[PDB]
Design an enzyme around this catalytic site. Sequence first.
Site, PDB file in Angstrom:
ATOM      1  N   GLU A 170     -33.024  43.283  17.527  1.00 17.67           N
ATOM      2  CA  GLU A 170     -32.288  42.534  17.007  1.00 17.67           C
ATOM      3  C   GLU A 170     -31.791  43.006  15.128  1.00 17.67           C
ATOM      4  O   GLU A 170     -30.762  43.318  15.115  1.00 17.67           O
ATOM      5  CB  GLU A 170     -33.453  41.476  16.225  1.00 17.67           C
ATOM      6  CG  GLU A 170     -33.850  40.682  17.284  1.00 17.67           C
ATOM      7  CD  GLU A 170     -32.940  39.742  17.576  1.00 17.67           C
ATOM      8  OE1 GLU A 170     -32.076  39.851  16.963  1.00 17.67           O
ATOM      9  OE2 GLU A 170     -33.533  39.093  18.535  1.00 17.67           O
ATOM     10  N   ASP A 221     -22.480  28.726  14.984  1.00 14.79           N
ATOM     11  CA  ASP A 221     -22.924  27.181  15.242  1.00 14.79           C
ATOM     12  C   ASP A 221     -22.898  27.590  13.516  1.00 14.79           C
ATOM     13  O   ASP A 221     -23.612  26.396  12.845  1.00 14.79           O
ATOM     14  CB  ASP A 221     -24.222  27.478  15.231  1.00 14.79           C
ATOM     15  CG  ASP A 221     -25.558  27.250  14.616  1.00 14.79           C
ATOM     16  OD1 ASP A 221     -25.192  28.033  13.867  1.00 14.79           O
ATOM     17  OD2 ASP A 221     -26.957  27.667  15.384  1.00 14.79           O
ATOM     18  N   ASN A 260     -24.328  33.180  13.296  1.00 13.77           N
ATOM     19  CA  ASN A 260     -23.902  32.543  14.925  1.00 13.77           C
ATOM     20  C   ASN A 260     -22.975  31.943  14.470  1.00 13.77           C
ATOM     21  O   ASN A 260     -22.484  30.592  13.345  1.00 13.77           O
ATOM     22  CB  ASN A 260     -25.318  32.116  14.265  1.00 13.77           C
ATOM     23  CG  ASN A 260     -26.554  32.328  14.362  1.00 13.77           C
ATOM     24  OD1 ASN A 260     -26.493  33.633  15.026  1.00 13.77           O
ATOM     25  ND2 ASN A 260     -27.283  32.938  13.686  1.00 13.77           N
ATOM     26  N   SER A 319     -25.386  28.950  11.298  1.00 14.63           N
ATOM     27  CA  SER A 319     -25.889  29.418  10.710  1.00 14.63           C
ATOM     28  C   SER A 319     -26.074  31.344  10.285  1.00 14.63           C
ATOM     29  O   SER A 319     -25.485  31.913  10.946  1.00 14.63           O
ATOM     30  CB  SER A 319     -27.273  29.106  11.429  1.00 14.63           C
ATOM     31  OG  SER A 319     -27.096  29.939  12.339  1.00 14.63           O
ATOM     32  N   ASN A 321     -33.550  33.195  12.046  1.00 15.47           N
ATOM     33  CA  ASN A 321     -32.790  31.962  11.640  1.00 15.47           C
ATOM     34  C   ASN A 321     -31.906  30.328  10.615  1.00 15.47           C
ATOM     35  O   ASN A 321     -33.325  30.305  10.545  1.00 15.47           O
ATOM     36  CB  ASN A 321     -32.217  31.941  13.296  1.00 15.47           C
ATOM     37  CG  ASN A 321     -30.973  30.551  13.390  1.00 15.47           C
ATOM     38  OD1 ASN A 321     -30.678  31.126  14.427  1.00 15.47           O
ATOM     39  ND2 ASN A 321     -29.983  30.594  12.308  1.00 15.47           N
ATOM     40  N   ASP A 338     -28.533  34.833  10.942  1.00 15.52           N
ATOM     41  CA  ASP A 338     -29.278  35.615  11.129  1.00 15.52           C
ATOM     42  C   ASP A 338     -29.804  36.605   9.582  1.00 15.52           C
ATOM     43  O   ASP A 338     -29.029  37.084   9.646  1.00 15.52           O
ATOM     44  CB  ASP A 338     -29.573  36.817  12.056  1.00 15.52           C
ATOM     45  CG  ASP A 338     -29.910  35.108  13.618  1.00 15.52           C
ATOM     46  OD1 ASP A 338     -30.113  33.704  13.141  1.00 15.52           O
ATOM     47  OD2 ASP A 338     -29.624  35.557  14.249  1.00 15.52           O
TER      48      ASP A 338
END
Length: 129
Positions: A35, A48, A46, A50, A59, A52
């Site tokens: 990660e 969308d 992301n 959002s 998220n 992380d």
Amino acid sequence: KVFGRCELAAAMKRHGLDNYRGYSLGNWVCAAKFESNFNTQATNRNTDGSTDYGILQINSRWWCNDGRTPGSRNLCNIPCSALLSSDITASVNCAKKIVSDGNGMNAWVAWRNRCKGTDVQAWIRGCRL
Ligand SMILES: [Cl-]
Ligand SMILES: [Cl-]
Ligand SMILES: [Rb+]
């Protein structure tokens, strides 16, 4: 902060992640490796909208508040910035909630794709823990 492998293993154990929800310490170290490469300051947008955050790439759509993610729920009740701290407590506390949500560590797609089923004990091998 960029952790060493055994350093992070020890920190995660110190914060009660070894065998949390049945996932051995090597699972958690492996997830953090892929990660964030063990970097607490890692952030990634992301598609969308959002973002992380942190060592486990948590998220802003479900888990933390960053003020810019429409619909966020902030289920960990924390600013996303708290997940970037050199002290991993906030990221651990929130990861504990995520892994309890129903799908276990499959919540981290990179754990499913890169860690699940593998020799995860290798991630803690040699470590004084
Ligand atoms: Cl392990
Ligand atoms: Cl599970
Ligand atoms: Rb909330």
